[PDB]
Amino acid sequence: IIPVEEENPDFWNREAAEALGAAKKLQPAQTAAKNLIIFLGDGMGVSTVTAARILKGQKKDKLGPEIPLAMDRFPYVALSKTYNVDKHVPDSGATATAYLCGVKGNFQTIGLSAAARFNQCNTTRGNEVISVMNRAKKAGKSVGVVTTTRVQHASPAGTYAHTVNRNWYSDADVPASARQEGCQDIATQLISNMDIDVILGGGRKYMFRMGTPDPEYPDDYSQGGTRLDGKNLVQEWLAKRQGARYVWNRTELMQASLDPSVTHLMGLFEPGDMKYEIHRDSTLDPSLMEMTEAALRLLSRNPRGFFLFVEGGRIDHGHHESRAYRALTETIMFDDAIERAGQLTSEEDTLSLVTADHSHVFSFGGYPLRGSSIFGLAPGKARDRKAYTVLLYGNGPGYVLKDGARPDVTESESGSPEYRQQSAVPLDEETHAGEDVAVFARGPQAHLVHGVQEQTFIAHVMAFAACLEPYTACDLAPPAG
Amino acid sequence: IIPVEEENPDFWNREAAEALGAAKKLQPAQTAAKNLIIFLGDGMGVSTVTAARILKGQKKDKLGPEIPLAMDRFPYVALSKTYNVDKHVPDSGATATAYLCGVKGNFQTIGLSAAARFNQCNTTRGNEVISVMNRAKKAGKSVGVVTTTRVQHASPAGTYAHTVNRNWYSDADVPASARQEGCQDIATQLISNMDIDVILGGGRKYMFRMGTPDPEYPDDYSQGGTRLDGKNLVQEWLAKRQGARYVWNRTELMQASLDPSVTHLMGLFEPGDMKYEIHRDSTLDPSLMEMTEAALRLLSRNPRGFFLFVEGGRIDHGHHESRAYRALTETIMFDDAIERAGQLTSEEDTLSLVTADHSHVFSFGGYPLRGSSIFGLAPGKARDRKAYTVLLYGNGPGYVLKDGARPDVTESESGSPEYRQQSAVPLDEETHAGEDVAVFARGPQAHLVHGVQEQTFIAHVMAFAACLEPYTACDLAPPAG
Ligand SMILES: *[C@@H]1O[C@H](CO)[C@@H](O)[C@H](O)[C@H]1NC(C)=O
Ligand SMILES: *[C@@H]1O[C@H](CO)[C@@H](O)[C@H](O)[C@H]1NC(C)=O
Ligand SMILES: *[C@@H]1O[C@H](CO)[C@@H](O)[C@H](O)[C@H]1NC(C)=O
Ligand SMILES: *[C@@H]1O[C@H](CO)[C@@H](O)[C@H](O)[C@H]1NC(C)=O
Ligand SMILES: N[C@@H](Cc1ccccc1)C(=O)O
Ligand SMILES: N[C@@H](Cc1ccccc1)C(=O)O
Ligand SMILES: N[C@@H](Cc1ccccc1)C(=O)O
Ligand SMILES: N[C@@H](Cc1ccccc1)C(=O)O
Ligand SMILES: [Ca+2]
Ligand SMILES: [Ca+2]
Ligand SMILES: [Mg+2]
Ligand SMILES: [Mg+2]
Ligand SMILES: [Zn+2]
Ligand SMILES: [Zn+2]
Ligand SMILES: [Zn+2]
Ligand SMILES: [Zn+2]
């Protein structure tokens, strides 16, 4: 469909003149950031952003691509080079080292320099690189980790953990030799490495001893505690702090977030990862946006400010499944959380960055008409005389042959939340992609986020903005306010 | 391979500290641009940039992804939304309207608002939108069009032409009803719409009457003139201007570019598109970089400045073929032309933008090791127990089944300049992609290129920077110098 307003050049000329006006009004701050927020869309590459924008646009009144995402409104954009030291196409652990600790690492390690080696516990020590969240805490800020994955998953773990193996969620996962060598499982590291004021996401099971029924699924033994060492890490965490609260459901979370006596909050909402938003039980489980608000309620009390990590963690998971519907709906909820955090904080004193750890082999093509569903069919048949979707994957589990042939696909099929877009190469999981991802920034010193930068720049600009180590001699005036 | 230097956090911390230093040193100009250059990588989306960076890096001493492209050094980056008014995934003609005229258009039209309709000549008039190049000429600047495509191809045509059908290269292509209605073929528009000081690229055949042997291929009748109206447009163009020169080969081009009496230069180096760089005859044909230098030699003489359009036009063509080797080698040469133009001009008075018209369904995945060839195999077999490449396409002509099965692929095969990467969906040509593309900017007012913008912003910032209509009341001081 051609929107009539857009047929007049004046429409475009007015928009551009307004854009030039806004561009000209941008001024760099002379002042530091009181607060830091990093919003991490796991797997949210450029193609994901555009596709999500179109989907979000259409979910409102709109044709799609002309409607800004909340992230699109951020004034400063850079490209971020995501390669890990050892792999061009990276994983979440080693990218987390980059954007949270400011140093690049090796694939499937977390919080370690690239002197360490995956799955070799004895290469850990001396290679620990401290996150900006950790430095924020040291400087007296409150700190929070919020994600739709396990809070022990690679991205959130980057804020607090140092491990040669991102798969070491609980002690059950750690080989005996590594346990003897003192490489702590991530769940332990979560409660032990540093004080974290707010921890919200999945990963209940890693905190409890084998045999402990999950509070939510007490009749599914597979969801129970995993720990071999008999520890209840939740109780240990609570015991260390007056005003600490543990919650496992939404209503308790909301209650805790409004309770002035709650100074530390651990909310673990599923045994493993949280459900996709489309599957979320809204009585039992908070959305990402809700977890972010709950976090901000607590974190905002500290006069020294806060550092908050918010992850749209299952964007990534949707793409691995080659289910763009899941990737893109997770992206929208991620963007909704960005929007919500922007309502609850001030860009005068809050530096907010939105980025992705890496992308995926997700493409948006064919030549679909304006306003057509992102989950629809490309116009025109393929050379094998069957239909194809506008969304495709380079590889992944959407690759199919029914009786020697690529299957035809209908619109009703392609639009299903379970539909797997086709790919060139069958893999159980679609792969990450290595192309640059966007960094969006607003707030004090956001203007430093520019050009094409290494992914480590994300961590460094945040430290610098808040005058955290190694930039305590930042040359900045106190935060506005 | 893990580079040892990168195992030390200090490496990353030093780089980031240097990046922060450079970021802090950026200051906006108070002064106008004397000169404007737009470098257009046709089809050069984010995945293409990263893949080309890696390839370029490796062509030098290097592992790849850590080595900046010339474009990567530009200080200001924005994302550009490429949708056409009528299609989410755009073409080159209507995007050219956006980034060259500052108004979005309908798929496969050029230089027309979206009130016009593809292939309907009678919707043309009143919908012409004037390019910034045209406005630059009006303001007394010299202007140049340089591309590896036909100079009548959609992108360069955006600088001078207005047509409802980008396929109307010569009168041979224009239906009789359109010819009667006065819709001029693009080759005619090239010599007639405006004065263009430098025109360099392909497209000889459209300028000459049917039966005119091509100077380079006088024994291949398919390469001869196409025109039905008996006109020699080259002679007509030459006749209009004292100091005008026509050349069809590299040595004459170089000679003309150094000749002070040559004020207007038309260099048409192939009958249609120029050869891929890997196929270029370096005795007969200038590279993109050479054409850009030749252009700058002439354009730079004007004390009022110049507008120059430089297109890496066959990046796009490589992706359509699903031959990433061709896409990426064209990208490197494009980047080499950017680098060369940066040597020959000053960022104190030259606003240079690098962008793409749109992307492609090109992906860079698997989990290849650092330093591995971008054209190599992903580690690990696919689920059908055969190898697969790190580079894939969502759709296109690399889709194959040999005896009911996806073919296996070897490294020697995947590395060939003729290799077609596999795709999910067989199409004779791989499709464009609709995701945002990068805009890189440097020079006066380049700091206005920020955030996520409509693709029309490219044209408007350039007009504004040089105080061209509609921004003659730009509020800017004269160009530095
Ligand atoms: C780590 O342990 C492995 C297995 O015993 C051994 O081969 C290697 O030498 C150790 N590396 C270090 C740094 O001690
Ligand atoms: C939320 O958790 C508390 C236990 O902390 C429990 O008393 C309440 O029943 C829970 N809500 C639901 C709906 O299970
Ligand atoms: C363009 O010509 C077509 C074919 O005759 C006709 O259907 C249509 O009305 C014309 N449109 C305009 C704007 O005159
Ligand atoms: C280049 O063109 C001129 C004609 O303009 C011709 O005299 C010369 O032979 C040409 N060079 C080659 C190598 O064909
Ligand atoms: N990050 C993905 C897949 C992956 C990660 C790391 C290495 C390889 C694959 C998953 O855990 O959901
Ligand atoms: N809709 C609420 C629900 C909620 C809040 C806080 C905590 C838990 C739940 C939110 O945005 O805040
Ligand atoms: N731009 C491509 C293919 C294309 C353009 C426009 C529409 C559809 C396809 C080609 O001409 O090389
Ligand atoms: N290598 C030269 C060749 C050349 C120059 C000018 C014109 C034509 C050819 C270039 O960069 O300039
Ligand atoms: Ca739950
Ligand atoms: Ca030639
Ligand atoms: Mg993650
Ligand atoms: Mg082009
Ligand atoms: Zn990830
Ligand atoms: Zn992943
Ligand atoms: Zn194009
Ligand atoms: Zn194309």
CSV table of C-alpha atoms and ligand atoms in Angstrom, one decimal, chain B residues 40 42 92 99 147 149 153-156 311 313 316-317 357, ligand 12:
chain,number,residue,atom,x,y,z
B,40,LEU,CA,27.3,4.8,-2.7
B,42,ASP,CA,25.1,-0.4,-4.1
B,92,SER,CA,18.1,1.2,-6.5
B,99,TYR,CA,19.6,9.7,-0.9
B,147,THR,CA,30.2,4.4,-11.2
B,149,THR,CA,27.7,0.5,-13.7
B,153,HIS,CA,21.8,2.7,-14.3
B,154,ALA,CA,19.4,3.5,-11.4
B,155,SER,CA,21.9,4.9,-8.8
B,156,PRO,CA,23.8,7.4,-11.0
B,311,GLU,CA,29.3,4.3,-6.8
B,313,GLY,CA,27.9,-0.3,-8.3
B,316,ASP,CA,25.1,-5.3,-5.7
B,317,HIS,CA,25.6,-7.5,-8.8
B,357,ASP,CA,21.2,2.1,-1.1
C,12,MG,MG,23.5,1.1,-8.4
